[PDB]
């Protein structure tokens, strides 16, 4: 029944680039590992827009560390929408089931 | 007995091509990590000084003349730019293969046992 | 909790009430009982184990009758029923007096100068049978058989229990553990009849055959145990990193390879066909045993293997990196898988180590199977028992008012205060003249006075009553017999459980 | 708590009195039938001691216990079930005697085994051959039925009774295990049963004028479907989402209307006339037109059959269970010399006959569609199963107790064991022997006792099995009366007697266990 499969896309989507995240959020780690690599070496660039931002360490030292937490931060809205869509398609798998079964 | 693995015989191949299509993309992300590497490799090969044809935009390149060998780039973070030195560079041009490859080998033998769970159920479906 | 004089009575109400039903339901001559539950279940036997199963015990001590009597269940399944009478008794006799004569402990070692006078006793009561003569075995077989009460196929077939048992008859620990049943190992038959269920040496191996997996028949070429000790090394003794990318798959899967061609050579140079390989098997060790054409039967279970170590009687490999034909494949040997109604059976044949014999059942169906085997269950642990002790004893109550004089004896000789434990102990003994003066239908006191004037002077030594017959016999006319294993057995197991119950006046949460 | 002693013994033995008694009469002509609202709590009606046994709730332990071995007997018998029963108590009370007297239950059961041997060994003695022929086959046949149902009944039954036994003897098979398919059909009247040496089917499906009369018989007996489920079913039963379940019907008629195309050439290769009649019988349904252009092609066609009648009908038309409506060999599809679908009632049953097997015969009880048409069923069953064992056995003796008297006047006097410890069973087990015809004759007449001394003196006289007259309750040579036990069934009562009347005196306790 499409009420097994309703919410399961809804759920998903806030999961999609959560999962690119969780990615993004180990290489925080390793931003943070390439910032404190860098000492000025070879530059650094929080790339955002369009533009090449000009970037610093301790500019995107905060940043790759505030970066880590927000790419922590989709993980919840997500964890907010991951129980909304899973359980109500919990309760909408019996629903049209015996209906069309009826 | 027969129709219940016609219908449990859908999921199985989703769970080998789930399976079979995510291992094989993850070396096309590999190629640029061998790639910058190697694009890096040749870059500290020649000089700084030497004719860089690099890409402008589609149906077109445009030339330019490089200054820098021991700038070079890594991605990692977010959406960000972490210059490197050619061999730090390297060797996350290089690490990130290690991880990458990791994630990527580990599906091999679970497309074979989700096909060995579908393949079992085909029989089961046909007996 | 439960404790104190409560406990100590309790120590006789348990193991008394159990054992009270009970004698009725001894001898081959014997009082059935009914059973009814809650559940409308009903059950009538003369089986007190299986009276012992559904029965429920809210004592501990009937709980732990139980337990002693799975014990001589755990050695034999028979005298169980008769083991739980004997203590039964004595709690029951003794300790009312000698516990309000105030005592755990004189009986207690009583109990032991109870258990050696039997032994005593047992010397000359038992009278050695030879396995040579098979109905000098087998007629004690045929008594141990029809206590159960089938001769039918049963007896034929007990030859192949004297047979097996005593063809399994094998390893002297150098005080000789020979004397065994379990070394046999059961063929089980679909089709066929007990008539053409005969042994065949070694193990015959029906468990993990219900198809050949080990060619068809085979006679010179060894049938090979190979242990686990299979899997790869990758290094010389070692084991490096495994197949990963393209040329590991090479290198490293062939560095598994080398290591187990290495351990395959062994197996073929001994001139295998058929080897059986049990778990820790690699694919590198059969496909050089196919690369010699010898398969090698894997992944199949230990006791198998060790019928199949008793099958050829080979051993088991306990260095499969260096092998030998006198390890695995010994003597010429031999393979046969038999298809025999249904089921191809392997039969790995010749076998060294001293003999082998396992029991070959054919039932037409598998219950004319089953009743064979089951009273064959009797004489291929009566075989044991002779195997044991090769003592045939007089039945009845032949050893039981003898031990008692030679007890009471004992008391008027010692004349201490375990001369009435004696005296407790010595009255334990006419259970079998009482159980079978109830199993005949007589009157005991008589017979009671009668058998102590068959004690008077012949000593009882072949005479008890036997019910069977009704009369005070020696059971030489009546050629009742058991080893001496199987009394003191059944004699000492009880004797323990009468120490043990008597020791426990407490329980505790 | 445990019943020991006598208690594992009174309870038990005091149970198996009433039992006895409630049935002393489920037996001979003196016999009377017992109802059952209680037991299964239904509106039920029975005649026979094993069967009113298993329909009752026997929460009683021993009630249960003789309906295992007595079904054993009850299987080929199928009386003497209720007499069975009756001598073991009759046994029982006198085992109890002796241990009221005081005695031991072991030597009194030792006591039984002689004895019964020795009226084993009577029994081959009593045993007389009267071998099988209808008379003997009647008065055995009447005797049970005598016993299952009235006299009139039996003699009413007694011609189907023996009408197919005769083609069992043309099997040469001493039991029936075909022949023995019953029609039971719809009337008013209980005694009509109706002998067709085929089948009977209560089919010729939905349509007429398909030439329901068939001289010529080429059975198709098939499972196929010109018919067969519209309701919803994916995975075989209605499915989670609607729509996939729909896929399946359209393809249903189809099949069906080309099946009835298969047929047509069915009917011209099988026959190519009409003249030649052919039948297609359907283990399901069949559509309208399926039948309607079947009934074009000069075919009767039967819809939703039964496994029995699909084999039966494949043994005695020598018909087929063959799957396909497409053309086949006439050979195979099976034969009867006459085939009609007769209608008594709102049913249209196919009488089908003359069947090339004269092997699965219907004997069609009419009746007034009751348990009352279910009880005039189940007793000339049973009264076959008493000729059988006529069949079985050459020897066939005079019933009525004939044989009870002579024992006990053969056994005790000497002593058979010459021994008393033997003589307590053996006087015990010669009195079992008696209670049936000295009970029912006093249910049916004059008492045990001046009815024995007759039935005695006359075999103390002769030794003759002299019986009971239970048309008055006085002894008479039961050869004449009809009245005809077998060998067999004496045989395996005393087996079935003593065996369970020996573990249970042999109880040395009973409880309640877990």
């Given at each position: 029944?499409?009420?097994?499969?309703?919410?399961?896309?809804?759920?998903?989507?806030?999961?999609?680039?959560?999962?690119?995240?969780?990615a993004?959020?180990?290489?925080?780690?390793?931003?943070?590992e390439?910032?404190?690599?860098?000492?000025?070496?070879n530059?650094?660039?929080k790339?955002?827009?369009?533009?090449?931002?000009?970037?610093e360490?301790?500019?995107?030292?905060?940043?790759?560390?505030?970066?880590?937490?927000?790419?922590?931060?989709?993980?919840?809205?997500?964890?907010?929408?991951?129980?909304?869509?899973?359980?109500?398609?919990?309760?909408?798998?019996?629903?049209?089931?015996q209906?069309?079964?009826? | 007995?027969?129709?219940?693995?016609?219908?449990?015989?859908?999921?199985?191949?989703?769970?080998?091509?789930?399976l079979?299509?995510?291992?094989?993309?993850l070396?096309?992300?590999?190629?640029?990590?061998?790639?910058?590497?190697?694009?890096?490799?040749?870059?500290?090969?020649?000089?700084?000084?030497?004719?860089?044809?690099?890409?402008?935009?589609?149906?077109?390149?445009?030339?330019?003349?490089?200054?820098?060998?021991?700038?070079?780039?890594?991605?990692?973070?977010?959406?960000?730019?972490?210059?490197?030195?050619?061999?730090?560079?390297?060797?996350?041009?290089?690490?990130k293969?290690?991880?990458?490859?990791?994630?990527?080998?580990?599906i091999?033998?679970?497309?074979?046992?989700?096909?060995?769970?579908?393949?079992?159920?085909?029989?089961?479906?046909?007996? | 909790?439960?404790?104190?004089?409560?406990?100590?009575?309790?120590?006789?109400?348990?193991?008394?009430?159990?054992?009270?039903?009970?004698?009725?339901?001894?001898?081959?001559?014997?009082?059935?009982?009914?059973?009814?539950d809650?559940?409308?279940?009903?059950?009538?036997?003369?089986?007190?184990?299986?009276?012992?199963?559904?029965?429920?015990?809210?004592?501990?001590?009937?709980?732990?009758?139980?337990?002693?009597?799975?014990t001589?269940?755990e050695?034999?399944?028979?005298?169980?029923?008769?083991?739980?009478?004997?203590?039964?008794?004595?709690?029951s006799?003794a300790?009312?007096?000698?516990e309000?004569?105030?005592?755990?402990?004189?009986?207690?070692?009583?109990?032991?100068?109870?258990?050696?006078?039997?032994?005593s006793?047992?010397?000359?009561?038992?009278?050695?049978?030879?396995?040579?003569?098979?109905?000098?075995?087998?007629?004690?077989?045929?008594?141990?058989?029809?206590?159960?009460?089938?001769?039918?196929?049963?007896?034929?077939?007990?030859?192949?229990?004297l047979?097996?048992?005593?063809?399994?008859?094998?390893?002297?620990?150098?005080?000789?553990?020979?004397?065994?049943?379990?070394?046999?190992?059961?063929?089980?038959?679909?089709?066929?009849?007990?008539?053409?269920?005969?042994?065949?040496?070694?193990?015959?191996?029906?468990?993990?055959?219900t198809?050949?997996?080990?060619?068809?028949?085979?006679?010179?070429?060894?049938?090979?145990?190979?242990?686990?000790?299979?899997?790869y090394?990758?290094?010389?003794?070692?084991?490096?990193?495994?197949?990963?990318?393209?040329?590991?798959?090479?290198?490293?899967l062939?560095?598994?390879?080398?290591?187990?061609?290495?351990?395959?050579?062994?197996?073929?140079?001994?001139?295998?066909?058929?080897?059986?390989?049990?778990?820790?098997?690699?694919?590198?060790?059969?496909?050089?045993?196919?690369?010699?054409?010898?398969t090698?039967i894997?992944r199949?279970?230990?006791?198998?293997?060790?019928?199949?170590?008793?099958?050829?009687?080979?051993?088991?490999?306990?260095?499969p990196?260096?092998?030998?034909?006198?390890?695995?494949?010994?003597?010429?040997?031999?393979?046969?898988?038999?298809?025999?109604?249904?089921?191809?059976?392997?039969?790995?044949?010749?076998?060294?180590?001293?003999?082998?014999?396992?029991?070959?059942?054919?039932?037409?169906?598998?219950?004319?199977?089953?009743?064979?085997?089951?009273?064959?269950?009797?004489?291929?642990?009566?075989?044991?028992?002779?195997?044991?002790?090769?003592?045939?004893?007089?039945?009845?109550?032949?050893?039981?008012?003898?031990?008692?004089?030679?007890?009471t004896?004992?008391?008027?000789?010692?004349?201490?205060?375990?001369?009435?434990?004696?005296?407790?102990?010595?009255?334990?003994?006419?259970?079998?003249?009482?159980?079978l003066?109830?199993?005949?239908?007589?009157?005991?006191?008589?017979?009671?006075?009668?058998?102590?004037?068959?004690?008077?002077?012949?000593?009882?030594?072949?005479w008890?009553?036997?019910?069977?017959?009704?009369?005070?016999?020696?059971?030489?006319?009546?050629?009742?017999?058991?080893?001496?294993?199987?009394?003191?057995?059944?004699?000492?197991?009880?004797?323990?459980?009468?120490?043990?119950?008597?020791?426990?006046?407490?329980?505790?949460? | 708590?445990?019943?020991?002693?006598?208690?594992?013994?009174?309870v038990?033995?005091?149970?198996?009195?009433?039992?006895?008694?409630?049935?002393?009469?489920?037996?001979?002509?003196?016999g009377?039938?017992?109802?059952?609202?209680?037991?299964?709590?239904?509106?039920?009606?029975?005649?026979?001691?094993?069967?009113?046994?298993?329909?009752?709730?026997?929460?009683?332990?021993?009630?249960?216990?003789?309906?295992?071995?007595?079904?054993?007997?009850?299987?080929?018998?199928?009386?003497?079930?209720?007499?069975?029963?009756?001598?073991?108590?009759?046994?029982?009370?006198?085992?109890?005697?002796?241990?009221?007297?005081?005695?031991?239950?072991?030597?009194?059961?030792?006591?039984?085994?002689?004895?019964?041997?020795?009226?084993?060994?009577?029994?081959?003695?009593?045993?007389?051959?009267?071998?099988?022929?209808?008379?003997?086959?009647?008065?055995?046949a009447?005797?049970?039925?005598?016993?299952?149902?009235?006299?009139?009944?039996?003699?009413?039954?007694?011609?189907?009774?023996?009408?197919?036994?005769?083609?069992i003897?043309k099997?040469?098979?001493?039991?029936?295990?075909?022949?023995?398919?019953?029609?039971?059909?719809?009337?008013?009247?209980?005694?009509?049963?109706?002998?067709?040496?085929?089948?009977?089917?209560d089919?010729?499906?939905?349509?007429?004028?398909?030439?329901?009369?068939?001289?010529?018989?080429?059975i198709?007996?098939?499972?196929?479907?010109?018919?067969?489920?519209?309701?919803?079913?994916?995975?075989?039963?209605?499915?989670?989402?609607?729509?996939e379940?729909?896929?399946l019907?359209?393809?249903?008629?189809?099949?069906?209307?080309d099946?009835?195309?298969?047929?047509?050439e069915?009917?011209?290769?099988?026959?190519?006339?009409?003249?030649?009649?052919?039948?297609?019988?359907?283990?399901?349904?069949?559509?309208?037109?399926?039948?309607?252009?079947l009934?074009?092609?000069?075919?009767?066609?039967?819809r939703?059959?039964?496994?029995?009648?699909?084999?039966?009908?494949?043994?005695?038309?020598?018909?087929?269970?063959?799957?396909?409506?497409?053309?086949?060999?006439?050979?195979?599809?099976?034969?009867?010399?006459?085939?009609?679908?007769?209608?008594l009632?709102?049913?249209?049953?196919?009488?089908?006959?003359?069947?090339?097997?004269?092997?699965?015969?219907?004997?069609?009880?009419?009746?007034?569609?009751?348990?009352?048409?279910?009880?005039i069923?189940?007793?000339?069953?049973?009264?076959?199963?008493?000729?059988?064992?006529?069949?079985?056995?050459?020897?066939?003796?005079?019933?009525?107790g004939?044989?009870?008297?002579?024992?006990?006047?053969?056994?005790?006097?000497?002593?058979?064991?010459?021994?008393?410890?033997?003589?307590?069973?053996?006087?015990?087990?010669?009195?079992?022997?008696?209670?049936?015809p000295?009970?029912?004759?006093?249910n049916?007449?004059?008492?045990?006792?001046?009815?024995?001394?007759?039935?005695?003196?006359?075999?103390?006289?002769?030794?003759?099995?002299?019986?009971?007259?239970?048309?008055?309750?006085?002894?008479?040579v039961?050869?004449?009366?009809?009245?005809?036990?077998?060998?067999?069934?004496?045989?395996?009562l005393?087996?079935?007697?003593?065996?369970?009347?020996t573990n249970?005196?042999?109880?040395?306790?009973?409880?309640?266990?877990?």
């Amino acid at each position: 029944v499409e009420k097994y499969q309703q919410l399961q896309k809804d759920l998903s989507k806030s999961m999609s680039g959560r999962q690119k995240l969780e990615a993004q959020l180990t290489e925080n780690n390793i931003v943070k590992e390439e910032l404190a690599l860098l000492d000025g070496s070879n530059v650094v660039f929080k790339l955002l827009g369009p533009v090449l931002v000009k970037q610093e360490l301790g500019e995107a030292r905060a940043t790759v560390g505030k970066r880590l937490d927000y790419i922590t931060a989709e993980i919840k809205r997500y964890e907010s929408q991951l129980r909304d869509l899973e359980r109500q398609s919990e309760q909408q798998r019996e629903t049209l089931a015996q209906l069309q079964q009826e | 007995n027969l129709p219940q693995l016609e219908m449990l015989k859908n999921q199985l191949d989703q769970e080998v091509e789930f399976l079979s299509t995510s291992i094989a993309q993850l070396k096309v992300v590999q190629t640029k990590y061998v790639e910058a590497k190697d694009c890096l490799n040749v870059l500290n090969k020649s000089n700084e000084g030497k004719e860089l044809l690099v890409p402008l935009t589609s149906s077109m390149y445009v030339p330019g003349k490089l200054h820098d060998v021991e700038h070079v780039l890594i991605d990692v973070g977010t959406g960000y730019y972490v210059e490197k030195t050619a061999e730090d560079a390297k060797d996350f041009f290089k690490r990130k293969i290690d991880f990458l490859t990791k994630q990527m080998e580990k599906i091999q033998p679970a497309l074979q046992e989700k096909h060995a769970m579908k393949q079992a159920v085909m029989e089961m479906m046909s007996q | 909790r439960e404790s104190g004089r409560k406990v100590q009575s309790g120590n006789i109400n348990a193991a008394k009430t159990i054992a009270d039903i009970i004698r009725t339901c001894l001898g081959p001559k014997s009082m059935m009982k009914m059973l009814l539950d809650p559940m409308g279940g009903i059950v009538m036997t003369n089986d007190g184990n299986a009276i012992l199963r559904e029965i429920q015990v809210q004592h501990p001590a009937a709980k732990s009758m139980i337990e002693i009597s799975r014990t001589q269940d755990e050695e034999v399944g028979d005298g169980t029923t008769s083991v739980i009478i004997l203590a039964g008794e004595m709690l029951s006799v003794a300790e009312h007096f000698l516990e309000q004569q105030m005592h755990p402990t004189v009986v207690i070692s009583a109990y032991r100068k109870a258990l050696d006078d039997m032994i005593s006793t047992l010397k000359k009561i038992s009278i050695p049978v030879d396995i040579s003569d098979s109905d000098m075995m087998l007629n004690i077989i045929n008594s141990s058989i029809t206590t159960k009460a089938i001769s039918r196929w049963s007896s034929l077939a007990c030859n192949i229990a004297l047979d097996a048992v005593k063809m399994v008859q094998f390893e002297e620990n150098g005080r000789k553990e020979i004397d065994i049943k379990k070394y046999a190992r059961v063929e089980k038959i679909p089709g066929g009849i007990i008539e053409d269920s005969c042994v065949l040496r070694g193990v015959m191996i029906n468990k993990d055959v219900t198809h050949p997996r080990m060619r068809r028949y085979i006679k010179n070429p060894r049938i090979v145990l190979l242990d686990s000790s299979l899997e790869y090394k990758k290094g010389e003794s070692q084991t490096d990193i495994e197949i990963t990318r393209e040329e590991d798959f090479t290198r490293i899967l062939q560095m598994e390879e080398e290591y187990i061609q290495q351990l395959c050579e062994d197996i073929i140079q001994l001139k295998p066909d058929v080897v059986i390989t049990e778990k820790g098997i690699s694919d590198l060790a059969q496909h050089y045993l196919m690369r010699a054409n010898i398969t090698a039967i894997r992944r199949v279970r230990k006791t198998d293997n060790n019928r199949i170590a008793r099958a050829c009687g080979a051993r088991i490999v306990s260095r499969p990196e260096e092998l030998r034909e006198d390890d695995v494949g010994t003597g010429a040997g031999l393979l046969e898988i038999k298809k025999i109604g249904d089921e191809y059976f392997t039969f790995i044949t010749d076998c060294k180590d001293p003999k082998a014999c396992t029991i070959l059942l054919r039932g037409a169906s598998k219950e004319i199977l089953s009743e064979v085997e089951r009273n064959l269950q009797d004489a291929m642990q009566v075989c044991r028992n002779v195997l044991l002790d090769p003592q045939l004893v007089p039945g009845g109550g032949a050893s039981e008012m003898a031990v008692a004089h030679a007890l009471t004896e004992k008391s008027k000789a010692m004349t201490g205060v375990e001369q009435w434990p004696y005296r407790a102990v010595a009255q334990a003994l006419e259970v079998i003249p009482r159980t079978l003066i109830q199993n005949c239908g007589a009157s005991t006191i008589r017979l009671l006075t009668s058998l102590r004037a068959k004690h008077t002077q012949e000593n009882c030594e072949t005479w008890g009553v036997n019910g069977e017959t009704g009369t005070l016999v020696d059971m030489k006319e009546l050629g009742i017999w058991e080893p001496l294993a199987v009394k003191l057995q059944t004699y000492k197991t009880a004797v323990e459980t009468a120490v043990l119950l008597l020791r426990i006046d407490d329980i505790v949460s | 708590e445990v019943a020991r002693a006598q208690a594992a013994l009174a309870v038990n033995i005091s149970a198996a009195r009433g039992l006895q008694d409630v049935l002393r009469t489920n037996l001979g002509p003196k016999g009377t039938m017992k109802m059952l609202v209680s037991g299964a709590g239904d509106i039920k009606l029975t005649k026979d001691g094993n069967v009113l046994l298993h329909e009752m709730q026997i929460q009683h332990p021993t009630a249960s216990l003789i309906a295992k071995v007595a079904t054993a007997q009850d299987d080929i018998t199928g009386d003497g079930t209720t007499s069975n029963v009756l001598i073991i108590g009759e046994l029982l009370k006198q085992a109890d005697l002796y241990i009221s007297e005081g005695l031991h239950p072991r030597i009194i059961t030792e006591g039984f085994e002689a004895a019964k041997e020795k009226a084993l060994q009577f029994l081959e003695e009593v045993k007389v051959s009267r071998e099988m022929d209808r008379e003997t086959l009647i008065d055995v046949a009447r005797t049970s039925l005598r016993t299952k149902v009235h006299a009139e009944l039996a003699d009413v039954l007694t011609e189907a009774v023996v009408d197919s036994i005769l083609a069992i003897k043309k099997q040469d098979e001493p039991i029936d295990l075909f022949m023995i398919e019953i029609m039971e059909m719809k009337h008013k009247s209980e005694t009509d049963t109706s002998l067709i040496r085929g089948l009977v089917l209560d089919h010729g499906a939905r349509h007429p004028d398909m030439k329901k009369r068939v001289e010529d018989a080429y059975i198709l007996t098939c499972n196929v479907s010109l018919e067969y489920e519209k309701t919803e079913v994916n995975s075989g039963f209605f499915y989670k989402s609607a729509e996939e379940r729909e896929k399946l019907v359209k393809a249903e008629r189809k099949f069906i209307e080309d099946r009835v195309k298969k047929i047509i050439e069915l009917k011209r290769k099988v026959c190519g006339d009409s003249d030649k009649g052919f039948v297609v019988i359907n283990q399901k349904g069949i559509d309208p037109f399926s039948l309607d252009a079947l009934s074009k092609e000069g075919i009767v066609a039967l819809r939703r059959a039964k496994r029995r009648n699909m084999e039966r009908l494949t043994l005695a038309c020598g018909g087929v269970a063959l799957n396909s409506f497409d053309d086949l060999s006439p050979d195979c599809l099976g034969h009867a010399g006459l085939v009609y679908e007769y209608t008594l009632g709102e049913e249209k049953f196919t009488f089908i006959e003359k069947c090339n097997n004269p092997r699965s015969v219907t004997l069609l009880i009419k009746g007034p569609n009751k348990h009352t048409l279910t009880q005039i069923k189940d007793a000339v069953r049973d009264g076959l199963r008493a000729v059988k064992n006529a069949i079985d056995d050459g020897c066939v003796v005079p019933g009525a107790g004939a044989v009870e008297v002579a024992m006990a006047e053969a056994l005790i006097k000497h002593k058979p064991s010459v021994k008393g410890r033997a003589q307590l069973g053996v006087q015990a087990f010669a009195d079992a022997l008696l209670i049936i015809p000295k009970v029912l004759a006093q249910n049916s007449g004059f008492d045990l006792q001046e009815t024995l001394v007759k039935i005695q003196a006359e075999h103390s006289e002769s030794g003759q099995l002299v019986g009971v007259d239970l048309n008055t309750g006085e002894p008479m040579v039961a050869a004449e009366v009809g009245v005809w036990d077998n060998y067999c069934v004496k045989k395996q009562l005393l087996h079935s007697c003593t065996v369970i009347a020996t573990n249970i005196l042999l109880v040395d306790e009973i409880m309640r266990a877990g």
